[PDB]
Every structure is written in C-alpha cells, then in structure tokens.
Amino acid sequence: MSNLEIKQGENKFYIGDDENNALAEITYRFVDNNEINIDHTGVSDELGGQGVGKKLLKAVVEHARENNLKIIASCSFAKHMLEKEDSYQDVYLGLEHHHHHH
C-alpha cells in the first residue's frame, strides 16, 4: 500500500522493500569536488519500458543540475544510457573526438 517511494540511503537511492529487495538502486560518490560518478546501478530491467532506472536517473540529474554537479559513470549501464540521452546533456560530459560539425 502506497509503496513507490525512493528510499534515501548513504549516497544511494533505492526503490524496493528493503536492502535485499532493492529492485532498482543507484549510487553516486563525490570523486573530486562537484564531479560525481554513478558508481553502481543495480536496476532490474524487465522490458525497458518498465525500467525503473529512468526514474532514478531523472532524480539524480535533476538534483545534480540544481547542485552544479557534473555526472560521470563508472558503470557502463548508466554511462551508455546517458550517452544516447541528449536530454541530460547538461551534467553529462561524455567523450568526443572533436569531429562535431554535427
């Protein structure tokens, strides 16, 4: 009953019953100063459309933008998702070989 909330933990946000029933969680740490990395993303993805990770990503990027935080990712899962998503291009650095006329 009324269980779609995000549990706030130590630099980690997880959605689930408990620590074991953490069906979707994301972690971020301050590697340098305002630069944060998505350390680990334990998000179960059923069919993509039911990927709770998007809700977590939204929250992290939203929070980061307002905090002037720069988001990188140590996990390829998160790294590649933000890579294709130019909607989060504010805090996402990425990588490019300067071949960007477009």
Side-chain angles (χ1 to χ4, degrees):
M1 297 182 178
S2 56
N3 290 146
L4 193 58
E5 51 177 81
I6 307 176
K7 281 63 174 56
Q8 182 183 271
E10 305 176 89
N11 283 32
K12 64 182 300 90
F13 299 118
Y14 58 96
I15 302 179
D17 297 281
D18 77 290
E19 298 163 272
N20 295 89
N21 276 28
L23 301 178
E25 60 91 56
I26 183 175
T27 61
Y28 66 102
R29 76 176 77 230
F30 298 87
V31 290
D32 200 77
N33 281 91
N34 294 329
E35 300 69 42
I36 59 172
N37 69 325
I38 301 174
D39 181 276
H40 172 63
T41 313
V43 175
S44 316
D45 175 46
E46 307 183 276
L47 291 175
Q50 292 176 89
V52 189
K54 294 191 178 68
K55 186 175 185 175
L56 298 176
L57 262 59
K58 189 193 78 72
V60 176
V61 177
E62 192 176 297
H63 192 113
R65 177 188 288 139
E66 302 304 296
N67 280 213
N68 291 271
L69 300 178
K70 308 180 186 183
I71 297 183
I72 53 177
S74 300
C75 43
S76 44
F77 182 67
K79 186 177 183 292
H80 191 238
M81 287 190 301
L82 299 175
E83 181 190 282
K84 67 85 179 181
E85 196 56 77
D86 57 76
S87 310
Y88 300 130
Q89 192 181 150
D90 299 274
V91 296
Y92 187 70
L93 299 178
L95 184 63
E96 209 285 285
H97 192 55
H98 200 257
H99 194 209
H100 190 80
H101 195 211
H102 185 255

mmCIF file of all heavy atoms in Angstrom, residues 60-81:
data_model
loop_
_atom_site.group_PDB
_atom_site.id
_atom_site.type_symbol
_atom_site.label_atom_id
_atom_site.label_comp_id
_atom_site.label_asym_id
_atom_site.label_seq_id
_atom_site.Cartn_x
_atom_site.Cartn_y
_atom_site.Cartn_z
ATOM 1 N N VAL A 60 18.453 11.910 -10.129
ATOM 2 C CA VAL A 60 19.875 12.205 -9.979
ATOM 3 C C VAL A 60 20.286 13.413 -10.820
ATOM 4 O O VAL A 60 20.911 14.341 -10.309
ATOM 5 C CB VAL A 60 20.756 10.989 -10.348
ATOM 6 C CG1 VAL A 60 22.235 11.339 -10.269
ATOM 7 C CG2 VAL A 60 20.443 9.811 -9.438
ATOM 8 N N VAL A 61 19.919 13.406 -12.098
ATOM 9 C CA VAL A 61 20.268 14.504 -12.998
ATOM 10 C C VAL A 61 19.611 15.806 -12.548
ATOM 11 O O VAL A 61 20.241 16.867 -12.560
ATOM 12 C CB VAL A 61 19.855 14.197 -14.454
ATOM 13 C CG1 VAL A 61 20.151 15.382 -15.366
ATOM 14 C CG2 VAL A 61 20.563 12.948 -14.960
ATOM 15 N N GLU A 62 18.351 15.712 -12.140
ATOM 16 C CA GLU A 62 17.600 16.866 -11.657
ATOM 17 C C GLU A 62 18.296 17.475 -10.443
ATOM 18 O O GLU A 62 18.525 18.685 -10.379
ATOM 19 C CB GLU A 62 16.180 16.424 -11.298
ATOM 20 C CG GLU A 62 15.207 17.559 -11.042
ATOM 21 C CD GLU A 62 13.804 17.047 -10.788
ATOM 22 O OE1 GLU A 62 13.223 16.421 -11.701
ATOM 23 O OE2 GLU A 62 13.283 17.244 -9.671
ATOM 24 N N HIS A 63 18.655 16.615 -9.497
ATOM 25 C CA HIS A 63 19.339 17.038 -8.285
ATOM 26 C C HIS A 63 20.712 17.617 -8.629
ATOM 27 O O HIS A 63 21.116 18.650 -8.092
ATOM 28 C CB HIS A 63 19.485 15.840 -7.335
ATOM 29 C CG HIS A 63 19.920 16.189 -5.941
ATOM 30 N ND1 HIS A 63 19.103 16.034 -4.843
ATOM 31 C CD2 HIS A 63 21.100 16.656 -5.466
ATOM 32 C CE1 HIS A 63 19.759 16.393 -3.754
ATOM 33 N NE2 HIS A 63 20.973 16.774 -4.104
ATOM 34 N N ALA A 64 21.415 16.951 -9.540
ATOM 35 C CA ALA A 64 22.767 17.346 -9.918
ATOM 36 C C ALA A 64 22.793 18.699 -10.620
ATOM 37 O O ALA A 64 23.667 19.521 -10.345
ATOM 38 C CB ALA A 64 23.400 16.285 -10.802
ATOM 39 N N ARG A 65 21.842 18.925 -11.521
ATOM 40 C CA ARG A 65 21.765 20.187 -12.254
ATOM 41 C C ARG A 65 21.630 21.358 -11.287
ATOM 42 O O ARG A 65 22.352 22.352 -11.390
ATOM 43 C CB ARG A 65 20.585 20.181 -13.233
ATOM 44 C CG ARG A 65 20.410 21.502 -13.968
ATOM 45 C CD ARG A 65 19.124 21.539 -14.779
ATOM 46 N NE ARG A 65 19.182 20.685 -15.965
ATOM 47 C CZ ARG A 65 18.174 19.917 -16.378
ATOM 48 N NH1 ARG A 65 17.064 19.817 -15.653
ATOM 49 N NH2 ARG A 65 18.275 19.235 -17.514
ATOM 50 N N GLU A 66 20.727 21.220 -10.325
ATOM 51 C CA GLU A 66 20.468 22.280 -9.361
ATOM 52 C C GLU A 66 21.635 22.437 -8.382
ATOM 53 O O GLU A 66 21.765 23.470 -7.722
ATOM 54 C CB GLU A 66 19.178 21.992 -8.589
ATOM 55 C CG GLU A 66 17.949 21.849 -9.477
ATOM 56 C CD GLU A 66 17.722 23.054 -10.369
ATOM 57 O OE1 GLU A 66 17.461 24.156 -9.838
ATOM 58 O OE2 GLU A 66 17.810 22.910 -11.609
ATOM 59 N N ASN A 67 22.477 21.410 -8.284
ATOM 60 C CA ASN A 67 23.617 21.440 -7.365
ATOM 61 C C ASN A 67 24.922 21.750 -8.092
ATOM 62 O O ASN A 67 25.983 21.776 -7.472
ATOM 63 C CB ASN A 67 23.760 20.110 -6.613
ATOM 64 C CG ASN A 67 22.806 19.977 -5.439
ATOM 65 O OD1 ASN A 67 23.130 19.353 -4.430
ATOM 66 N ND2 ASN A 67 21.619 20.544 -5.567
ATOM 67 N N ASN A 68 24.838 21.980 -9.405
ATOM 68 C CA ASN A 68 26.020 22.285 -10.225
ATOM 69 C C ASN A 68 26.979 21.099 -10.275
ATOM 70 O O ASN A 68 28.180 21.263 -10.496
ATOM 71 C CB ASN A 68 26.751 23.525 -9.698
ATOM 72 C CG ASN A 68 25.963 24.802 -9.896
ATOM 73 O OD1 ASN A 68 26.081 25.462 -10.926
ATOM 74 N ND2 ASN A 68 25.161 25.169 -8.907
ATOM 75 N N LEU A 69 26.437 19.902 -10.103
ATOM 76 C CA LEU A 69 27.244 18.692 -10.094
ATOM 77 C C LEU A 69 27.442 18.166 -11.511
ATOM 78 O O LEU A 69 26.550 18.274 -12.355
ATOM 79 C CB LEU A 69 26.580 17.616 -9.231
ATOM 80 C CG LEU A 69 26.357 17.994 -7.761
ATOM 81 C CD1 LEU A 69 25.644 16.874 -7.025
ATOM 82 C CD2 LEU A 69 27.679 18.310 -7.080
ATOM 83 N N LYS A 70 28.614 17.612 -11.765
ATOM 84 C CA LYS A 70 28.915 17.003 -13.052
ATOM 85 C C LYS A 70 28.783 15.495 -12.930
ATOM 86 O O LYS A 70 29.360 14.898 -12.024
ATOM 87 C CB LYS A 70 30.335 17.367 -13.497
ATOM 88 C CG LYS A 70 30.624 18.859 -13.471
ATOM 89 C CD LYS A 70 32.040 19.163 -13.930
ATOM 90 C CE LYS A 70 32.367 20.634 -13.750
ATOM 91 N NZ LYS A 70 33.723 20.975 -14.249
ATOM 92 N N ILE A 71 28.026 14.880 -13.825
ATOM 93 C CA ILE A 71 27.747 13.456 -13.717
ATOM 94 C C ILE A 71 28.560 12.635 -14.711
ATOM 95 O O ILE A 71 28.448 12.802 -15.928
ATOM 96 C CB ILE A 71 26.246 13.145 -13.916
ATOM 97 C CG1 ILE A 71 25.412 13.809 -12.818
ATOM 98 C CG2 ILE A 71 26.009 11.639 -13.925
ATOM 99 C CD1 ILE A 71 23.936 13.491 -12.916
ATOM 100 N N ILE A 72 29.390 11.763 -14.171
ATOM 101 C CA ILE A 72 30.046 10.731 -14.954
ATOM 102 C C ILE A 72 29.572 9.373 -14.453
ATOM 103 O O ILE A 72 28.822 9.305 -13.480
ATOM 104 C CB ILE A 72 31.587 10.824 -14.872
ATOM 105 C CG1 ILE A 72 32.056 10.835 -13.412
ATOM 106 C CG2 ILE A 72 32.084 12.060 -15.611
ATOM 107 C CD1 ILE A 72 33.561 10.859 -13.250
ATOM 108 N N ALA A 73 29.988 8.299 -15.093
ATOM 109 C CA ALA A 73 29.535 6.977 -14.694
ATOM 110 C C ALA A 73 30.660 5.962 -14.781
ATOM 111 O O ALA A 73 31.372 5.897 -15.782
ATOM 112 C CB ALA A 73 28.355 6.543 -15.553
ATOM 113 N N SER A 74 30.823 5.181 -13.725
ATOM 114 C CA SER A 74 31.802 4.109 -13.718
ATOM 115 C C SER A 74 31.163 2.825 -14.235
ATOM 116 O O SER A 74 31.849 1.893 -14.652
ATOM 117 C CB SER A 74 32.355 3.912 -12.304
ATOM 118 O OG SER A 74 32.985 5.099 -11.837
ATOM 119 N N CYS A 75 29.839 2.791 -14.212
ATOM 120 C CA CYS A 75 29.095 1.657 -14.724
ATOM 121 C C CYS A 75 28.676 1.906 -16.171
ATOM 122 O O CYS A 75 28.100 2.949 -16.491
ATOM 123 C CB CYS A 75 27.877 1.392 -13.843
ATOM 124 S SG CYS A 75 26.995 2.888 -13.357
ATOM 125 N N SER A 76 28.974 0.948 -17.039
ATOM 126 C CA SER A 76 28.683 1.071 -18.461
ATOM 127 C C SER A 76 27.184 1.210 -18.717
ATOM 128 O O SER A 76 26.767 1.909 -19.641
ATOM 129 C CB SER A 76 29.241 -0.147 -19.194
ATOM 130 O OG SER A 76 28.950 -1.335 -18.473
ATOM 131 N N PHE A 77 26.387 0.551 -17.881
ATOM 132 C CA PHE A 77 24.929 0.603 -17.982
ATOM 133 C C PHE A 77 24.432 2.047 -17.946
ATOM 134 O O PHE A 77 23.725 2.494 -18.850
ATOM 135 C CB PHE A 77 24.308 -0.213 -16.840
ATOM 136 C CG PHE A 77 22.804 -0.265 -16.860
ATOM 137 C CD1 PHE A 77 22.129 -0.921 -17.878
ATOM 138 C CD2 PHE A 77 22.069 0.330 -15.849
ATOM 139 C CE1 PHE A 77 20.746 -0.978 -17.885
ATOM 140 C CE2 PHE A 77 20.688 0.278 -15.851
ATOM 141 C CZ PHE A 77 20.026 -0.377 -16.871
ATOM 142 N N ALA A 78 24.830 2.777 -16.914
ATOM 143 C CA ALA A 78 24.433 4.166 -16.767
ATOM 144 C C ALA A 78 25.120 5.036 -17.816
ATOM 145 O O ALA A 78 24.505 5.935 -18.395
ATOM 146 C CB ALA A 78 24.775 4.653 -15.370
ATOM 147 N N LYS A 79 26.388 4.735 -18.070
ATOM 148 C CA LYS A 79 27.210 5.521 -18.986
ATOM 149 C C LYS A 79 26.605 5.557 -20.388
ATOM 150 O O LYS A 79 26.541 6.616 -21.015
ATOM 151 C CB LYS A 79 28.628 4.939 -19.039
ATOM 152 C CG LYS A 79 29.609 5.762 -19.859
ATOM 153 C CD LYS A 79 31.008 5.167 -19.797
ATOM 154 C CE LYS A 79 32.024 6.007 -20.558
ATOM 155 N NZ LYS A 79 31.787 5.988 -22.027
ATOM 156 N N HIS A 80 26.143 4.407 -20.865
ATOM 157 C CA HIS A 80 25.630 4.301 -22.224
ATOM 158 C C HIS A 80 24.212 4.870 -22.333
ATOM 159 O O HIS A 80 23.812 5.349 -23.394
ATOM 160 C CB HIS A 80 25.653 2.842 -22.690
ATOM 161 C CG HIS A 80 25.398 2.677 -24.157
ATOM 162 N ND1 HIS A 80 24.365 1.919 -24.666
ATOM 163 C CD2 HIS A 80 26.058 3.178 -25.229
ATOM 164 C CE1 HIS A 80 24.403 1.961 -25.986
ATOM 165 N NE2 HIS A 80 25.420 2.717 -26.352
ATOM 166 N N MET A 81 23.454 4.824 -21.240
ATOM 167 C CA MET A 81 22.096 5.363 -21.249
ATOM 168 C C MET A 81 22.119 6.880 -21.374
ATOM 169 O O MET A 81 21.385 7.457 -22.175
ATOM 170 C CB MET A 81 21.316 4.960 -19.995
ATOM 171 C CG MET A 81 20.901 3.497 -19.969
ATOM 172 S SD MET A 81 19.750 3.131 -18.628
ATOM 173 C CE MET A 81 20.728 3.612 -17.206
#
